[PDB]
Design a protein around this ligand. Structure first.
Ligand SMILES: NC(=O)N[C@@H](CC(=O)O)C(=O)O
Ligand SMILES: NC(=O)N[C@@H](CC(=O)O)C(=O)O
Ligand SMILES: [Zn+2]
Ligand SMILES: [Zn+2]
Ligand SMILES: [Zn+2]
Ligand SMILES: [Zn+2]
Ligand SMILES: [Zn+2]
Ligand SMILES: [Zn+2]
Lengths: 362, 362
């Protein structure tokens, strides 16, 4: 007896095209998405070249339209030079991404004044998401208040961060956040096994107390999102390991396991992988789209999942209960039992659909 | 023809007693204050032991009462363990100091939640000052808003910081700030001469653009304060140089030079070294107290000033115009032309004066 879920949405993925296609491309990363029960992804802009201007966005849009197997939206990235220049194309993007700490990106902003300039110039009705760790969460919240608008905090990983956001929500401030599976299911206790190269990720893995604080404060978490950040094993195990974990194929099985154990409800899961992504990013419905899962199947995560070109996973060896059996995307069978059955290019840019534009005053 | 000034107040000094008395003690640091035309100092809590609990404050109070030559108030320091424990003694302190970045202190707080706990537990009518650099300024401002109270930002040094504070003031937020003389009169252009050891200070010396932004935004600066941070030449030139500059004896001559050049007015100076310190920290008047300065005397700062045990200065070689000729403190001649004439112990804790308590609702 399968359970039918709506088309799930991952608002934080790195698909590496253009410029890092040995790590992943649109075709491989969206195959991984479908195998993970995800039918729509929002792709981050820290590619090579980065998606920080109109020509780069135009290129990325065409590469995605030609390679994507599921539907998508593309983020623009904030840079030290592009505030005030993105107005014509802003509404075609998922939103604007700010990189406010050291991570796998060349887009760090060097002054809070540059953050203010982005918050002041980016259209006020369109999403802004921030990579903002520890005190940076409080700093970007201040900038959002000074500019009188909302912000969404990416990959919250620490007790400190979730409690700050909790306090902000208690004061009625317009802040939402997302949490990635590695910060719910891995901790410092796993760094022995992972090693210092594989274990590199931003935000770094938290303590057991961080993990327990995120679960305890599930009500404060608006979305789950994988931060699928594929890098090859050679890169993760080499001298200058880039941070990040692949995660599209493992996210839903990990969370279904938690549902089966009573750690959160099916509704809690669907708010965080469907309804809240839709409403925060104004992402449109997908007609005739659903995911069928088998909640009874017990399996052990292997050393690599079938589709991501990362060809490794930090969840290797974890026992899960729950698997994706079938995905239907816009009336076509997209995935069955380990086989992706829609070709590269089946996926569409949801921001071009009439229902996918963000509403705005004239 | 001398000019009579009121008793000037430095709200940010390190007098090193207890525990670092080779760098400075109450007697030597307050002699330096008097020679710099300063009649009241607020001493920071990063001593050894640090002033982070009632017994340490009691000791420091007695050492100051016995050694100080000018009047004073003593800050308490926030620690990772003392939130909620300072209520009985809080009103006897200048205020509470938070160390939110790496600097010469063991008091760094490791989580914004600890900042929130201090803002929630410290009595709401009493001052809070923060060492908060770059984005940390925005972060502590957010914490202040969440807790619905004011904050004072220590040693603002960068264009980024002064513009953030400017934006906060434009939104009506209760924030004040101070700037130290080295961030108005030294820059990266001076690191060649100073060297990497002497030049170590927190916040670090800024660019010419940082310095010009502070001057351009003088209206945003509420106070000048020296951040007199004496360390010996051996320490500054050694393998692990501590950050900080001595500055009590040079602050007023540097600023008088700027007044003579029309860079700010005498009133601008007196707001920032007298009236605003009084009103932000609720520091009492000093009866029969004044400073006589000679605005015409041109001199070159030497390799060390007479009184601070630091026995060095980063302003060596700068030409100044303006000198302190006489200080009268509470009816006694305290300083004339290079000689301090009040003994250790003449100075008093202003928080014990009836007029020196911070007003509060019953
Ligand atoms: N999280 C990571 O460790 N890496 C991400 C970048 C990011 O989300 O900050 C990546 O693109 O590799
Ligand atoms: N500013 C510094 O560089 N040093 C100060 C500490 C401080 O004010 O942060 C000190 O106590 O030495
Ligand atoms: Zn990130
Ligand atoms: Zn995100
Ligand atoms: Zn990411
Ligand atoms: Zn400081
Ligand atoms: Zn200060
Ligand atoms: Zn200081």
């Amino acid at each position: 007896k399968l359970v039918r879920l709506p088309g799930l949405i991952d608002v934080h993925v790195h698909l590496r095209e253009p410029g890092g296609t040995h790590k992943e491309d649109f075709a491989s990363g969206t195959a991984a998405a479908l195998a993970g029960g995800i039918t729509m992804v929002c792709a981050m802009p820290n590619t090579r070249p980065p998606i920080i201007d109109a020509p780069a966005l135009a290129l990325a849009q065409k590469l995605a339209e030609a390679g994507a197997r599921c539907d998508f939206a593309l983020f623009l990235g904030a840079s030290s030079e592009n505030a005030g220049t993105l107005g014509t194309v802003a509404g075609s993007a998922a939103g604007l991404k700010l990189y406010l700490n050291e991570t796998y990106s060349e887009l760090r902003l060097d002054s809070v004044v540059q953050w203010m300039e982005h918050f002041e110039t980016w259209p006020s009705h369109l999403p802004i998401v921030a990579h903002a760790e520890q005190q940076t969460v409080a700093a970007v919240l201040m900038v959002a208040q000074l500019t009188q608008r909302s912000v969404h905090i990416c990959h919250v990983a620490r007790k400190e961060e979730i409690l700050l956001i909790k306090a902000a929500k208690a004061r009625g401030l317009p802040v939402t956040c997302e949490v990635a599976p590695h910060h719910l299911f891995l901790s410092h206790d796993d760094l022995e096994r992972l090693g210092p190269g594989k274990g590199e990720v931003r935000p770094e893995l938290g303590s057991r107390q961080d993990v327990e604080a995120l679960w305890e404060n599930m009500a404060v978490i608006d979305c789950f999102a994988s931060d699928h950040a594929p890098h090859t094993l050679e890169e993760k195990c080499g001298s200058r390991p880039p941070p990040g974990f692949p995660g599209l194929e493992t996210m839903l099985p990990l969370l279904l396991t938690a549902v089966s154990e009573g750690r959160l409800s099916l509704d809690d899961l669907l708010q965080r992988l469907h309804h809240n992504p839709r409403r925060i990013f104004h992402l449109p419905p997908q007609e005739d789209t659903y995911v069928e899962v088998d909640l009874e199947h017990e399996w052990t995560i292997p050393s690599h999942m079938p589709f991501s070109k990362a060809h490794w996973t930090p969840f290797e060896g974890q026992k899960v209960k729950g698997t994706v059996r079938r995905v239907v995307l816009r009336g076509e069978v997209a995935y069955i039992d380990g086989q992706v059955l829609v070709p590269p290019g089946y996926g569409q840019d949801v921001r071009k659909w009439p229902q996918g534009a963000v509403p705005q005053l004239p």
